Amino acid sequence: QQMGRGSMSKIVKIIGREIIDSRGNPTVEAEVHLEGGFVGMAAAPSGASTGSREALELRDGDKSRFLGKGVTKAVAAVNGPIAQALIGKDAKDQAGIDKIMIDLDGTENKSKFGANAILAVSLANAKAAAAAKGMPLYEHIAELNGTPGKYSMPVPMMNIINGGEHADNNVDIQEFMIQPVGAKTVKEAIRMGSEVFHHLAKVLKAKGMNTAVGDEGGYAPNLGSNAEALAVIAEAVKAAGYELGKDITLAMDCAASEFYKDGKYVLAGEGNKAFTSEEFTHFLEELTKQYPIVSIEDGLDESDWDGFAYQTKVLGDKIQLVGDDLFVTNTKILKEGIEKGIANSILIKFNQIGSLTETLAAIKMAKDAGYTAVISHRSGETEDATIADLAVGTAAGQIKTGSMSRSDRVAKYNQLIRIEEALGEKAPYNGRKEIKGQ
Amino acid sequence: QQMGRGSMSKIVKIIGREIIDSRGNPTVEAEVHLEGGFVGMAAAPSGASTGSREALELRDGDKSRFLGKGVTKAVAAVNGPIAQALIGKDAKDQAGIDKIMIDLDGTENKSKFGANAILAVSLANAKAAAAAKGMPLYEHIAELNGTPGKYSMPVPMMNIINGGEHADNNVDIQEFMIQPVGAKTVKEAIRMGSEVFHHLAKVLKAKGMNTAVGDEGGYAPNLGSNAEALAVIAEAVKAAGYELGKDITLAMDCAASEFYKDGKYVLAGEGNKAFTSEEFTHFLEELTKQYPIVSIEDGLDESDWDGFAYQTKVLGDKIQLVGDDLFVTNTKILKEGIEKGIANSILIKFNQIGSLTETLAAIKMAKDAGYTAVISHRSGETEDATIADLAVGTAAGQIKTGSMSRSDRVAKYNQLIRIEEALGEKAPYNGRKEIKGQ
Ligand SMILES: O=C1[C@@H](P(=O)(O)O)C[C@H](O)N1O
Ligand SMILES: O=C1[C@@H](P(=O)(O)O)C[C@H](O)N1O
Ligand SMILES: [Mg+2]
Ligand SMILES: [Mg+2]
Ligand SMILES: [Mg+2]
Ligand SMILES: [Mg+2]
């Protein structure tokens, strides 16, 4: 007899704009407005060590604005043709909305409008549709995911010591992370992260080392080896009153594609030694023997599938092996990885593929195969906390959203705290059990 | 005959919670919910080099949580006594809401509930009431301020090189900043900042200096003197293709309190040389003749009032002299400063005094005496962008909200971008003429 406003979920307006990300580079933000007055707003993140098979960002390449990194053309895609194609459509139909943008762009890698333009609209849409349905984003996402009412709070892998490309040290491994698997709630996990992070600063200050931070809020001190990184962390964990290996485990992102040349892995700060696939795998195995490293990400080059089959054979029963640049959140690639015994986990980055619908498809493929899914940030982030709702709504079980500093990271932890406060034990923090091989 | 929901502006619930700030320390967030369904949310920032006379930030001191920096007591204050005193009150009456909290705390420095508790609610209340009136925060702020429909976009001062206490170098001056006075819009100002910040990273790398960032997203490289901080900024400005003095002026925060002992200013990075108050003023003066430094903040110790009078005589006709620790956003102190010819500008930090109403009284006192007001962040921030709305809605003319990295900073620039998009020339960017002494 009376039609409520929630039923008026047709798109009446889409606005795009150029804003600034956490590294000072432009990004695209979109607003999606519905007939009933609901609005969602979202922005695209941006990677610094991008896989070669990622969907493509659209930048302007004008050297007189933002050193060629403007996104005014992606913004005009949002305001002109994306807007045109979606006005009149039901935001609640996420898949239909995404399919429209994908077909209109027409390219394999979203190179006409940019995966940045398309993703920002895909996420803003989902938020507008959640508002129209009278629910928080995490709840809407679970329904779009095919898993209505099923939540978990994820176990975070928190970056605290950095190496590799553009880190003034002899550390080759791009990220060393702590995971507070002994916490009972995500709120306690976050407190634990914070305590270790502040104790690490004290440790590094006592060694004379630098405590300024990188892109992800963690430290990049002048260390002498990949091993010294694991030791300062061990020292910080103990000063915080926690036990390495039962309260807190360790995870790594090697970003090994960055040090792979002419078929060998070159460890620039490890006497500059060169390694085969098989040898770099054994170098990693030994590290997991000396330290409670339970997860290793991109331990070989994104094209070294023979090498990944062997790493999975050696380490996979015991260690989570996370493909990032390996799978680029792409179902066509993940599929083949699964069929070939390649890795046992996937890092989920929605701007690697460019839409929410295809991101949920990757999570689903992974879970169907017994692979774990770790929801992730990019180096370039914004104040947007969408990956927190996403992690909870897909019950992914793990998240990777930075150190315990910079609001580009901390906003996601804050949102995890608001969501857990609301769900309580309807969103269990499962701890060590989430991690492939425990 | 029918009442809108907007008229149901009575408070029905206030929730407080403990979240995390951009340094990894706890802070207070509050939600104010009104009968008509309107909700506002805000969080208190936190200083790192606080004035002696700031209102009190209440922390817990429990070593078992966050190294003693929990805010559960301030949170309990929000949830219990503050909520009980505000339920049933009209959120549109900001002065009346704040008065209730102030009278109920009962202390001069808000040391019973914490200025962090009271501020979070004061801001949250204002946001909820903005929504209840059907308007953006900046517009509501202008109406609260007694200046309805009067707006400007602030000229930002952007902190790109760091020294002082939280900086691992021999630069004594806490902050070196650029101001893009030559810009025509804030959007362009922001673009200029980003470009200069990226060119600075290249300049610093070519000198083999570290390009990681401190709390405010600026660089803290190992420079030999205070003057060398100015010189590398001028390389970066030129390498970005801008003209120092015309497109971009310079500003500084001395935080000179931090290096005052036994009545002298000791510059650890001009080889421990001790300066009388007047010689330090001469030191500053000499920098302003070498570089187009147009603003100097906290150039003497907060209690060195005779020094400040002197500094005002020497510098105040040509240079903006900003009291931060000197005035602590406190009308009692600022009044006395106005009376004594002390400074000509005030840094406005709402958590130094504890309420929006008292903040607006500080801005008004400044402007009534011809002093400029610069709305400011603290080192410890969140994803909250309230100071952008506050700057525009009071037409303050200036903002200090950090470097062009970290979303604890960039969120504020982004919100300035959204506001300028909505207002256009209803919110002029006035450029250099905002700065006291031009
Ligand atoms: O490889 C990476 C970088 P990127 O910016 O996403 O490339 C940061 C992220 O933690 N991760 O897994
Ligand atoms: O003195 C200060 C520090 P604080 O954290 O607020 O003390 C950072 C800010 O720019 N300002 O003016
Ligand atoms: Mg990468
Ligand atoms: Mg990675
Ligand atoms: Mg200070
Ligand atoms: Mg200051």
Author numbering:
A (entry chain B), B (entry chain A): -7 to 430
What does the paper say about this structure?
Prokaryotes express a single isoform of enolase which, in addition to acting as a key mediator of energy production, appears to be involved in the overall infection process - enhancing bacterial resistance, invasiveness, and tissue damage.
The binding mode of SF2312 in E. coli enolase structure is similar to that of human ENO2, the only other reported crystal structure of SF2312 bound to a protein. The hydroxamic acid mimics the carboxylate of 2-PGA coordinating with Mg1 as well as hydrogen bonding with Gln166, Asp316, and Lys392. The hydroxyl group of SF2312, analogous to the C-3-OH of 2-PGA, makes an extensive series of hydrogen bonds with Glu167, Lys392, and His369. Additionally, the hydroxamic acid of SF2312 serves as a more stable metal chelating group forming a 2.1 Å bond with Mg1, approximately 1 Å tighter than 2-PGA. Moreover, a 5-membered ring chelating complex formed between the hydroxamic acid of SF2312 and Mg1 as compared to only a 4-membered carboxylate coordination in 2-PGA, reflects a more stable and tighter binding event. SF2312 exerted potent inhibition on enolase, with Ki values of 3.4 nM.
